[PDB]
Design an enzyme around this catalytic site. Structure first.
Site, PDB file in Angstrom:
ATOM      1  N   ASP A  85       5.643  15.601   9.892  1.00 35.59           N
ATOM      2  CA  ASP A  85       5.594  15.092   8.528  1.00 35.59           C
ATOM      3  C   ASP A  85       4.170  14.751   8.135  1.00 35.59           C
ATOM      4  O   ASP A  85       3.885  13.675   7.569  1.00 35.59           O
ATOM      5  CB  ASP A  85       6.554  13.893   8.354  1.00 35.59           C
ATOM      6  N   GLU A 105      -2.926  -1.229  13.635  1.00 38.38           N
ATOM      7  CA  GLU A 105      -4.342  -1.229  13.345  1.00 38.38           C
ATOM      8  C   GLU A 105      -4.586  -0.577  11.961  1.00 38.38           C
ATOM      9  O   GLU A 105      -3.932   0.390  11.577  1.00 38.38           O
ATOM     10  CB  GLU A 105      -5.041  -0.461  14.468  1.00 38.38           C
ATOM     11  N   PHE A 106      -5.502  -1.154  11.186  1.00 39.44           N
ATOM     12  CA  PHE A 106      -5.793  -0.623   9.865  1.00 39.44           C
ATOM     13  C   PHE A 106      -6.678   0.632  10.006  1.00 39.44           C
ATOM     14  O   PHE A 106      -7.763   0.552  10.550  1.00 39.44           O
ATOM     15  CB  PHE A 106      -6.498  -1.642   8.990  1.00 39.44           C
ATOM     16  N   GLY A 107      -6.189   1.765   9.531  1.00 42.07           N
ATOM     17  CA  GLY A 107      -6.810   3.058   9.756  1.00 42.07           C
ATOM     18  C   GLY A 107      -7.695   3.603   8.647  1.00 42.07           C
ATOM     19  O   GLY A 107      -8.329   4.637   8.818  1.00 42.07           O
ATOM     20  N   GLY A 131       8.471   4.216   1.662  1.00 42.87           N
ATOM     21  CA  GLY A 131       9.351   5.355   1.817  1.00 42.87           C
ATOM     22  C   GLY A 131      10.769   4.873   1.682  1.00 42.87           C
ATOM     23  O   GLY A 131      11.028   3.672   1.486  1.00 42.87           O
ATOM     24  N   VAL A 132      11.705   5.792   1.807  1.00 43.34           N
ATOM     25  CA  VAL A 132      13.107   5.427   1.764  1.00 43.34           C
ATOM     26  C   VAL A 132      13.387   4.394   2.850  1.00 43.34           C
ATOM     27  O   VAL A 132      14.196   3.506   2.670  1.00 43.34           O
ATOM     28  CB  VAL A 132      14.029   6.656   1.937  1.00 43.34           C
ATOM     29  N   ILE A 166       0.802  -1.240   0.000  1.00 42.01           N
ATOM     30  CA  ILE A 166       0.000   0.000   0.000  1.00 42.01           C
ATOM     31  C   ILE A 166       0.828   1.280   0.000  1.00 42.01           C
ATOM     32  O   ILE A 166       0.305   2.369  -0.224  1.00 42.01           O
ATOM     33  CB  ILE A 166      -1.019   0.051   1.177  1.00 42.01           C
ATOM     34  N   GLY A 187      11.277   2.141   4.358  1.00 42.95           N
ATOM     35  CA  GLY A 187      10.252   1.126   4.597  1.00 42.95           C
ATOM     36  C   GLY A 187       9.290   0.787   3.485  1.00 42.95           C
ATOM     37  O   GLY A 187       9.063   1.555   2.554  1.00 42.95           O
TER      38      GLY A 187
HETATM   39  C1  LIG Z   1       1.700   3.500   3.253  1.00 40.24           C
HETATM   40  C2  LIG Z   1       1.176   4.129   4.547  1.00 40.24           C
HETATM   41  C3  LIG Z   1       2.198   5.086   5.178  1.00 40.24           C
HETATM   42  C4  LIG Z   1      -0.161   4.850   4.291  1.00 40.24           C
HETATM   43  C5  LIG Z   1      -0.013   5.844   3.083  1.00 40.24           C
HETATM   44  O1  LIG Z   1      -1.260   6.423   2.880  1.00 40.24           O
HETATM   45  N1  LIG Z   1      -1.270   3.901   4.085  1.00 40.24           N
HETATM   46  C6  LIG Z   1      -1.863   3.317   5.172  1.00 40.24           C
HETATM   47  C7  LIG Z   1      -3.147   2.876   5.103  1.00 40.24           C
HETATM   48  C8  LIG Z   1      -3.760   2.291   6.217  1.00 40.24           C
HETATM   49  C9  LIG Z   1      -3.001   2.227   7.404  1.00 40.24           C
HETATM   50  N2  LIG Z   1      -3.328   1.831   8.643  1.00 40.24           N
HETATM   51  C10 LIG Z   1      -2.275   1.989   9.427  1.00 40.24           C
HETATM   52  C11 LIG Z   1      -1.272   2.535   8.674  1.00 40.24           C
HETATM   53  C12 LIG Z   1       0.020   2.925   9.014  1.00 40.24           C
HETATM   54  C13 LIG Z   1       1.111   2.723   8.139  1.00 40.24           C
HETATM   55  C14 LIG Z   1       2.408   3.114   8.471  1.00 40.24           C
HETATM   56  C15 LIG Z   1       2.646   3.734   9.712  1.00 40.24           C
HETATM   57  C16 LIG Z   1       1.570   3.953  10.596  1.00 40.24           C
HETATM   58  N3  LIG Z   1       1.797   4.580  11.824  1.00 40.24           N
HETATM   59  C17 LIG Z   1       0.271   3.548  10.258  1.00 40.24           C
HETATM   60  N4  LIG Z   1      -1.743   2.689   7.376  1.00 40.24           N
HETATM   61  N5  LIG Z   1      -1.208   3.217   6.347  1.00 40.24           N
END
Ligand SMILES: CC(C)[C@@H](CO)Nc1ccc2ncc(-c3cccc(N)c3)n2n1
Length: 328
Positions: free
Chosen positions: A179, A136-138, A23-24, A20, A26
């Site tokens: 950031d 957790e999926f956000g 970054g540099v 999904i 990860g």
């Molecule tokens: C690729 C990541 C940074 C992000 C870009 O929109 N996409 C999501 C989507 C759902 C989701 N739930 C938790 C996280 C997430 C991902 C990386 C770091 C953190 N703190 C939370 N993410 N990241």
């Protein structure tokens, strides 16, 4: 000692992984663990190979992100300073192994559809160490949602939620995100009509407009507890301050101006700057299902514009939340 990849990513979990983002420092996959969606960030540490144009971080250099992720995860269950506006951290592991081929297949799919700025992570040896963070999926990030929001009223809720969450973190932890670009704001549908937060013992509510916002990705963030500061020292980073093409890259320079290149200090005006960048995105780069053609909607637009032109005269997210007319 480290665990094998299979500890964290057994076959079925691995098979459901989809990349999904990146970054540099990860690669990020979404998958399903025990019928529950999760996001997994995988960072190479301690090895000699160049990765994505840079030397690998040491374990000590990843510790700030881990600690800050753990602290912000606690905020959803606190009492005096409470918010669900960050994201849960489920687990952290140190894993050893070469990259699983099923993850490479996911990586390839993303490169083929979205295109990647990273090296294909296929050169790591069987002794390579990684940190694996399970969140957790956000939901879906604001950038991907830029054509999907209902109206400017939804944008106001999102701005109010972000401001409140940052205020709660400033109050509890002297937190700066540093950031907070629009890929680091996630939106998830909720049937809750109002969301609750508590700031220094006072509880308030925010109309949700059907969305719960989560602020994520603490790679550059800073906070402190009991006078011990945890942060990402970017004082010798040249490249972070020379971007262009987006107001995002001005924010890095504006933060440095505000803090005199001293990243250990607390300058919550950095939260205000990011909020200003986000208000700018809302007014300029979003398409809405409902245009601002009713008087009610037109008023909301005027209020967001007035927020955009006045908010930089505030000192912190707390100041904005408590004093700005947008939130009255
Ligand atoms: C690729 C990541 C940074 C992000 C870009 O929109 N996409 C999501 C989507 C759902 C989701 N739930 C938790 C996280 C997430 C991902 C990386 C770091 C953190 N703190 C939370 N993410 N990241």
């Amino acid at each position: 000692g480290p665990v094998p990849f299979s500890h964290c990513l057994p076959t079925e979990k691995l098979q459901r992984c989809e990349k999904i983002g990146e970054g540099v420092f990860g690669e990020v996959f979404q998958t399903i663990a025990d019928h529950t969606p999760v996001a997994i960030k995988i960072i190479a540490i301690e090895g000699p190979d160049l990765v994505n144009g840079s030397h690998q971080k040491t374990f000590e250099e990843i510790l700030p992100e881990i600690i800050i992720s753990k602290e912000l995860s606690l905020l959803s269950g606190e009492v005096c300073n409470r918010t669900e506006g960050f994201i849960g951290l489920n687990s952290v592991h140190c894993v050893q192994g070469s990259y699983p081929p099923l993850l490479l297949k996911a990586w390839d799919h993303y490169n083929s559809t979205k295109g990647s700025a990273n090296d294909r992570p296929d050169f790591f040896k069987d002794d390579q160490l990684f940190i694996v963070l399970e969140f957790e999926f956000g939901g879906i990030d604001l950038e991907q949602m830029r054509t999907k929001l209902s109206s400017l009223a939804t944008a106001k809720s999102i701005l109010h939620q972000l401001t409140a969450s940052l205020a709660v973190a400033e109050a509890s932890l002297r937190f700066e995100h540093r950031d907070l670009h629009w890929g680091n704001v996630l939106l998830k549908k909720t049937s809750l009509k109002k969301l609750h937060y508590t700031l220094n013992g006072k509880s308030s509510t925010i109309p949700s407009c059907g969305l719960q916002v989560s602020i994520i990705d603490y790679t550059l963030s800073r906070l402190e507890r009991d006078g011990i500061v945890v942060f990402c020292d970017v004082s010798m980073d040249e490249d972070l301050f020379t971007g262009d093409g987006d107001y995002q890259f001005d924010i890095y320079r504006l933060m440095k101006k505000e803090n005199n290149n001293r990243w250990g200090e607390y300058h919550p005006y950095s939260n205000v700057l990011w909020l200003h960048y986000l208000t700018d995105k809302m007014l300029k780069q979003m398409t809405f299902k409902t245009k601002c053609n009713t008087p009610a909607m037109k008023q909301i637009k005027r209020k967001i514009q007035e927020f955009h032109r006045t908010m930089l005269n505030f000192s912190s997210a707390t100041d904005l939340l408590c004093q700005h007319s947008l939130f009255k």
